[PDB]
Every structure is written in structure tokens, then in C-alpha cells.
């Protein structure tokens, strides 16, 4: 006698990008295998995958780069079907990213030593691509909200680039007023925008940096990796709107030409985002639509401010519950706010 | 249990190889990044160059 086969998730439909809008049951799974294009700048002569040569001796007083010389993050979007059909007051039914899987495409393209590299010594081969790497990707239901950081505030950027505003010495430290969104492929330069670690309740990003003058780049390729994107509460990146946002950027190191010019190099990136269906509280009830009905039509009023730094609302006493009459009308809360401490 | 289905990626797609090497035919600009035009099948010893 043998043994009755074991059970396995009965695979269903398969095909191109237009598979998605076919409706499924309630406990569906989905697997999405997709990639991205790295944006290294792409100079001329169809060398799509390098950058232009780097500047050598720009002083701090005046910097003049070009659009080509700065790599940028890569982002895209995945449309999704909606799931609710009738009203169904109460609860809704959204998507969820659960398990990512990344893998770099073209990693053995660096073994070319018959290229236009520098002759490394007199009768040997050439010099391979070495130096600083920075690999980075992100999966979420929302655009990747990011923090503005740079050095040398006197840099005047080219006007195709989305760069932070009013450069001071405060921009060389963690500043609060350089917030923005990520809504455009090939526009945000990588030397000016780290991910904001504060604001991301619906975006998980992974990144390992290694600078240095000339260090080896170490790459893996394995189809047994698995990175769980669940949090410590039991959710993944939820999809508020019908989308799923993918953002990444891959730097591989510097290439040396045969005469001495340095120029960058990158590769693409794989993704396998397993999705599924969850049950949440409705964030769009009829009461939200009603307020957005009236607030479209009602007249704009532009008066003196009532929110922000130059505000004029002073003290708001939000109190409901009752209590035994206090023996002080103005009770104080902090014990010593400013400090009258020792020594 | 099946031959190793691979992916064609290369740089400097204007390089001309000898006849023994099975290279990606019709080399385009897309081959230096993720391209879809270069599926293949591993079936032949000493044939597919690893770069």
C-alpha cells in the first residue's frame, strides 16, 4: 500500500497583469511577481545603466551638478480591485501585504574584465566595480514618507530634481521642516532623502549601508529567503486606497574607466508580495461622505489663522466628567518643569 | 527535477562572441537592466557564459 497524497493550496488562475480584476472568494491568496527599473541617470550613447562622471573639485562655496550625476529612487504602483459590493454598514474588507522576497537581477554582470575598465596592472585584467553600496527597498500601502537630510547647504540643484526648501545649517542635522512625499519615479536624488523613521505606520523599509573607499560588494541569490512583514500586533502594510506601493533603489558601487573617470552602476530588483484579505473597521462611513459632501460646496473663508505657529486659540478646557470639588482650582501637574535642582 | 530556467542579463550588448557560446540573441538596450526578452533553458555543457 502507498499513501494518499497530502494537501496543497489548489492553484487557480494565472497570467499577465490583467488577472487581478477577476473576483475570487473570501479566503483568497494572491502572489505578485514584479520588478523595478533602477534609475542611475542614463547618460547618452545607449549606456542605459551607468551615470555620468563625477565631479572632482567643487568647493563648498558653489556647487553646480547636473541631472545625470545623481541617482534616484525607483517607485511604481499596482492597481487593485475593490472588494465591498453593497453598502454593508459596519465592516469593510481590505488587502494586506504579508511576505516579501527580494533578489537582485543581473549580479553576474560584474565579471566582465574585457570592458573599458582601468588596466589594473601591466599584463593582468581590469579593475572590477568596487566601493560603496547602498541597497534599499520598501513595501507599503502608502507612499514612502521621507526625511530631508543633506550636507553642504550651498548646493544649487538642477530644476528637474525635487529637492528640499530653504537650505540652512539646520538642514545638516535632523530638522523637522524638510518633510515630503515620494510620488514620482526618477526625481528624488538619493544623496538628499533618507526614509523618515517617524511617520511610517504603513510602510516597512529595509536597508544595509556600507561606505568606504574600496570594499567588496557581497551579493546573495537564493530562492529560500522569506521576510515576514507582520508587525508585533498582527497586521501588515494595509491598503487604504486600492493600490500597493513599491519603492526601491539599488546602488552597486563605482566603475572606473580606462583613463580614470568614475561612474556609478546599479541593477534591478525582484519582488514577490503575497497579499490576502482582512476585516477592519470602516474608515469611510456615510458620515464621512456627508461631511465631504458639504465641505466641497461651502464658501472659502480666509481670515486670521487658528492653527499653527502664529495661532490665536489660547486655552481649551475639554472637560466632561465630575469629581469631588478640588481644594485648588488650578491644580499643577508637572512637579518641576524647568528645574530648580542641585548644583 | 527540471532543467535550470534562467534569465539573460548582460552589460555592453555590442560585444560579439564566438560560435560555441549560446548568448542572448537580439541584444538590445534593455539587457543591461531587467529584460523579459531573454528566457532560456540550461541544457548544454560549456555553453552558457557566466557573465
Amino acid at each position: 500500500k502507498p499513501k494518499e497524497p497530502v494537501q496543497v493550496p489548489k492553484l487557480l488562475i494565472k497570467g499577465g497583469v490583467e488577472v487581478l480584476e477577476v473576483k475570487t472568494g473570501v479566503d483568497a491568496i494572491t502572489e505578485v511577481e514584479c520588478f523595478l527599473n533602477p534609475e542611475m541617470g542614463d547618460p547618452d550613447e545607449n549606456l542605459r545603466g551607468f551615470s555620468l562622471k563625477l565631479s572632482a573639485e567643487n568647493d563648498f562655496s558653489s556647487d553646480s551638478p547636473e541631472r545625470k550625476m545623481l541617482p534616484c529612487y525607483s517607485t511604481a504602483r499596482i492597481p487593485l480591485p475593490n472588494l465591498n459590493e453593497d453598502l454593508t454598514c459596519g465592516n469593510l474588507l481590505m488587502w494586506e501585504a504579508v511576505t516579501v522576497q527580494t533578489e537582485v537581477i543581473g549580479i553576474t554582470s560584474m565579471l566582465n574584465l574585457h570592458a573599458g575598465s582601468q588596466k589594473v596592472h601591466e599584463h593582468g585584467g581590469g579593475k572590477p566595480i568596487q566601493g560603496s553600496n547602498f541597497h534599499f527597498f520598501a513595501v507599503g500601502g502608502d507612499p514612502l514618507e521621507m526625511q530631508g537630510v543633506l550636507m553642504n547647504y550651498r548646493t544649487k540643484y538642477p530644476d528637474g530634481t525635487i529637492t528640499p526648501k530653504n537650505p540652512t545649517a539646520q538642514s545638516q542635522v535632523m530638522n523637522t521642516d524638510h518633510k515630503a512625499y515620494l510620488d514620482k519615479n526618477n526625481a528624488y536624488p538619493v544623496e538628499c532623502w533618507v526614509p523618515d523613521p517617524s511617520r511610517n505606520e504603513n510602510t516597512r523599509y529595509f536597508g544595509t549601508f556600507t561606505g568606504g573607499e574600496n570594499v567588496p560588494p557581497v551579493l546573495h541569490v537564493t530562492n529560500t529567503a522569506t521576510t515576514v512583514l507582520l508587525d508585533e500586533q498582527g497586521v501588515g502594510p494595509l491598503c487604504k486606497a486600492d493600490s500597493l506601493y513599491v519603492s526601491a533603489a539599488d546602488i552597486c558601487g563605482l566603475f572606473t574607466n580606462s583613463s580614470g573617470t568614475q561612474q556609478w552602476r546599479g541593477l534591478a530588483r525582484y519582488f514577490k508580495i503575497r497579499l490576502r484579505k482582512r476585516s477592519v473597521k470602516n474608515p469611510y462611513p456615510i458620515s464621512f461622505l456627508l461631511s465631504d459632501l458639504i465641505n466641497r460646496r461651502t464658501q472659502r473663508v480666509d481670515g486670521q489663522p487658528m492653527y499653527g505657529m502664529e495661532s490665536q486659540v489660547e486655552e481649551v478646557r475639554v472637560f466632561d466628567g465630575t469629581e469631588r470639588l478640588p481644594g485648588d482650582p488650578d491644580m499643577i501637574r508637572y512637579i518641576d518643569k524647568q528645574g530648580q535642582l542641585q548644583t | 527535477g527540471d532543467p535550470l530556467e534562467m534569465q539573460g542579463v548582460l552589460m555592453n550588448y555590442r560585444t560579439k562572441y564566438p560560435d560555441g557560446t549560446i548568448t542572448p540573441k537580439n541584444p538590445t538596450a534593455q539587457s543591461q537592466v531587467m529584460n523579459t526578452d531573454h528566457k532560456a533553458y540550461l541544457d548544454k555543457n560549456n555553453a552558457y557564459p557566466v557573465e
Partner: antibody
Amino acid sequence: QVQLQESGPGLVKPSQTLSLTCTVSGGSISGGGYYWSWIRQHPGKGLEFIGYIYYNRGTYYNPALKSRLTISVDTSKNDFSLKLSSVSAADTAVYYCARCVLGGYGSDAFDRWGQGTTVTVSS
Amino acid sequence: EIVLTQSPVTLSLSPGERAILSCRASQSVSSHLAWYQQKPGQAPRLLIYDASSRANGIPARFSGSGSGTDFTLTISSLAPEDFAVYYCQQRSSWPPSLTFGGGTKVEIR
């Protein structure tokens, strides 16, 4: 280094079928992120888009010309084609053919298109 | 569809001045813009791709600026080999349109 050319008729009678060849030499017509477009420019007006082709069954036409077109590709002579149906006297215009790139520049701009040819239709 | 309304009609401009064109769109596409230079009796040729990126071979006296709807073909100084016919073009992502505009021809006084 890619060289292009054009060829075809020089005079088309009313209510006939027009055919043109956008000759390509020095590159694959099966080229990955490449389209292959047509641009007409009528004497006295600007230019107008007609149609591009993707060699894994991607077509798109200008909806003003109402899907009266077929664009065919023959891989041997490295060249593609174009078909008009039921031409009129208004079609007398110099005709250009060019290429679109998806990952690089993003348009018909890389100094890469046909050198031009003229079509005359009258009585 | 999408229509690129272009204005002015025919600028009467002397050599050496600052020229500005404006290809204001019916709706925002904001990144898939081009600028085609064509002389009469010649073939088309690019000025600016992606609305700000200069072309290799075009010297830096031209530039591109602006995105959203109100676009700008910035010209620092006009050349006697530049008094010709200038166009604009809108691309398309989801739906295939990418038609073209109307044109503005620079008159030489």
C-alpha cells in the same frame, strides 16, 4: 549608429490603398523597449500622430483615423509597414517614421527617425 | 483626449533676446513632455526631453522648466540657426494618446 530610410509610391489615385515601408538598417526591429511610430505633417499645418507598433502585439492608432490601419512587421528585411484604406485628396503630405523608447529618454527624441518621403494625391 | 494648447502664435523676435514658450495642457501629465525642433525643409530634432533634461548635442543655452500644467521652453539667447518651427508633445501611461500640439513659429524681425 542605427540608420533608417523610407520607400514606397509617389502618386496615389482617389479611393486607393496606400502602403509604405520604413526601412531600418543596422539594428534589430525586434528591439526590447522600442516602439516604431509614424508622423505625418500636412503642408500648411503642424504634425499629427498616426500609430506605433510593439513587436509582441502592441498596437495603438490615432482615434481620429478611426482604426482604418494595419501595421505589419517583416523580420527578414528588418523593416515594418503601414496600410491606408480609402485615401482621399487630403492625404497629400510629407510622411515621417520614428521610434519611441520606454526606459531612456521617453519620446521621439534621440535624433533617430526616417529622413522623409512625400506622397501626392490628386485627381 | 488631451489637447496641448500652445501660445503665442507667431513671436516677432530679434536675435539675442530671451524667448519663452508655454505649452499649457488641458490636463496635467506633468512629466511626459517633449520639445521638438524642426526647421522648414528638414527633419525633426529634440530640444528637451522630460520637460527639463537637456539633450546631448544641444548646448546649455536652452533649458526646460516647470511641471504640472504650465510648461516652459526656456530660451536664453536665440540663434540665427534657430528661427524655425517649435512643437510640443504629451505622452501617455495608462491610456494611449500622446497626440501633439499646435506650434509656435518664431519670426525674425
